[PDB]
Design a protein around this ligand. Structure first.
Ligand SMILES: OC[C@H]1O[C@@H](O[C@H]2[C@H](O)[C@@H](O)[C@H](O)O[C@@H]2CO)[C@H](O)[C@@H](O)[C@H]1O
Ligand SMILES: OC[C@H]1O[C@@H](O[C@H]2[C@H](O)[C@@H](O)[C@H](O)O[C@@H]2CO)[C@H](O)[C@@H](O)[C@H]1O
Ligand SMILES: [Ca+2]
Ligand SMILES: [Ca+2]
Ligand SMILES: [Cl-]
Ligand SMILES: [Cl-]
Ligand SMILES: [Cl-]
Ligand SMILES: [Cl-]
Ligand code: NA
Ligand code: NA
Lengths: 231, 231
């Protein structure tokens, strides 16, 4: 160089006849540096309170893909600060092309399906930013993302590199086989990048990092697909 | 180098027998630079999404004063970046002591009492940050700040120096003589500072910058003081 509030007992969704499709949807957007000579060289727009809501959409759209699943963690090691440098996302992201891994924004959305009924703790870390919404309402409404995408509530967990919250966790009680809306919003402002998203349950001692049997996409429907299990 | 959502028709409050006290309450907090040699030298904590909610309270408390009113605008011109430099707030702030005007955080809260029934447009600008909540619920509950202070909603207006939103405005319909909860959250991260808060009404052509007959403080009460005028 559902209510929008985060909760420990989130609401979930009950899909009907159509088989859920594997994986999350992802959108990729540009995130330019500031003009040469600026101090610092990186743009602080990523921290504007509405950047994850409306601001990101004013940047150049790079891609929109389906079927993102597996292990979505990555570490991108840059060689120079203040410089756009190319790299590739892991194959799990279904995006073959190079992108500026030093400086970009990424949105992932869809549903998390548990295998365990009970408490789950999701652990996150990021360079630079990962904001997580989770649950109907807090993320978006069941099979009604089209009317609720931009209306997510306060984050269930968030991580900001360099901050007092560089890693974070969310503990929620979930029901096996129910589909929970999830939104992951990521940014790299400069230099190295990293995303880590894993979970554990009170059940066993394994950390889950491969979401192949956990992330799904559901079609929106006129009436929605609110969870039919809770009572 | 009331609902928490922002609205155009905010809810207000009806004080009982006790005469409203002149002015807002203010709290002042430290905001340190990063360690010498850091790039950039200023701390980005001010932009953490919970900094205006919980994070500011972890910093050193400098002052808590009553009776802030008059013209609250200021421009502080620093002579060196990355350096704590002393200055004084305007006399309107009722705080005589020097403080590090280059790097500090300030919270103001109380009620705005209009003189006009009709649309008001408040205009703000700041170096570095000014976040405004306005209306019962969005700011805090009528004569119930003690149970609602930390639960303000999405900002009615906000300004961030260097951003695509360096000035902002809020247009709201208000009733004369009703008391609207208001919260102003300010930060200077480095170097120069500035705060501007003014309004106009559709009625006349004058810009109001002297809040002497507009800002008030109301005691909290067990039952609250919800507005009795709307119907
Ligand atoms: O360390 C990861 C972190 O790097 C920041 O760049 C820093 C750099 O680490 C530091 O050595 C230098 O002095 O200042 C740089 C810019 O603030 C990235 O900005 C940050 O996004 C992370 O990737
Ligand atoms: O201009 C007000 C603005 O100054 C920032 O400091 C800048 C400075 O303006 C710029 O000339 C220099 O190259 O980089 C500095 C640090 O980013 C303050 O950081 C900012 O808070 C405002 O006060
Ligand atoms: Ca980075
Ligand atoms: Ca400044
Ligand atoms: Cl729903
Ligand atoms: Cl870089
Ligand atoms: Cl109220
Ligand atoms: Cl300074
Ligand atoms: Na596509
Ligand atoms: Na005092």
């Amino acid at each position: 160089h559902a209510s929008k509030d985060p909760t420990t007992f989130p609401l979930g969704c009950s899909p009907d006849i159509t088989t859920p499709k594997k994986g999350l949807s992802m959108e990729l957007y540009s995130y330019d540096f500031r003009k040469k000579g600026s101090y610092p060289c990186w743009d602080a727009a990523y921290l504007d309170p509405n950047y994850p809501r409306t601001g990101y959409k004013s940047h150049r759209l790079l891609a929109k893909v389906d079927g993102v699943t597996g292990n979505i963690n990555f570490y991108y090691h840059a060689t120079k600060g203040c410089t756009p440098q190319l790299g590739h996302l892991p194959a799990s992201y279904n995006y073959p092309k190079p992108l500026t891994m030093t400086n970009f924004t990424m949105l992932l959305y869809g549903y998390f399906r548990p295998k365990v009924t009970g408490f789950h703790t999701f652990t996150i870390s990021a360079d630079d930013l990962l904001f997580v919404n989770f649950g109907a309402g807090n993320a978006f409404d069941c099979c009604r993302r089209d009317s609720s995408a931009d209306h997510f509530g306060n984050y269930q967990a968030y991580a900001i590199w360099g901050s007092k919250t560089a890693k974070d966790e969310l503990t929620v009680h979930l029901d096996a086989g129910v589909y929970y809306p999830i939104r992951l919003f990521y940014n790299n402002r400069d230099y190295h990048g990293a995303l880590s998203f894993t979970f554990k349950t009170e059940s066993n001692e394994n950390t889950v990092s491969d979401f192949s049997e956990y992330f799904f996409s559901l079609d929106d429907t006129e009436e929605g697909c609110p969870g039919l299990i809770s009572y």
